[PDB]
Write a structure and sequence with these properties.
The PDB classes it as ligase. This protein has strands spanning about 5, 10-15, 20-25, 35-40, 50, 60-65, 80-90, 95, 100-105. It is mainly beta. It has one domain (about 1-105): Sandwich (Immunoglobulin-like), CATH 2.60.40.
Length: about 110
């Protein structure tokens, strides 16, 4: 079994009761420098200084963080394509990623 980063749903409409939970299940022995970064699917710098998961992803192998996708400065488009990315802090090596999540803005 390999390291995985899955999500409750890969499509979220803004202003719904249904929230998006991010389930990470990493088989690698994790470092306390690990994190999940929330970046827009954008043809730009692969650093993509963007949103992220805070405390709770601080080098934990497996767990979940539920999050309300609210229409803020990050969510301006009619359909915001985002992706969560669990990086292993050592070398900043991408350990796991979610499919491109379609955040729809009605």
């Amino acid at each position: 079994s390999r390291s995985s980063l899955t999500a409750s749903m890969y499509e979220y409409t803004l202003g719904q009761a249904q929230n998006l939970i991010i389930f990470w299940d990493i088989k690698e022995e994790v470092d306390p420098s690990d994190w999940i970064g929330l970046y827009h699917i954008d043809e730009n710098s692969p650093a993509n200084f963007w949103d992220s998961k805070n405390r709770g992803v601080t080098g934990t192998q497996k767990g979940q963080i539920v999050w309300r996708i609210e229409p803020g400065p990050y969510f301006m488009e009619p359909e915001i394509k985002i992706c969560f990315k669990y990086y292993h802090g050592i070398s900043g090596a991408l350990r796991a990623t979610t499919p491109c999540i379609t955040v729809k803005n009605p």
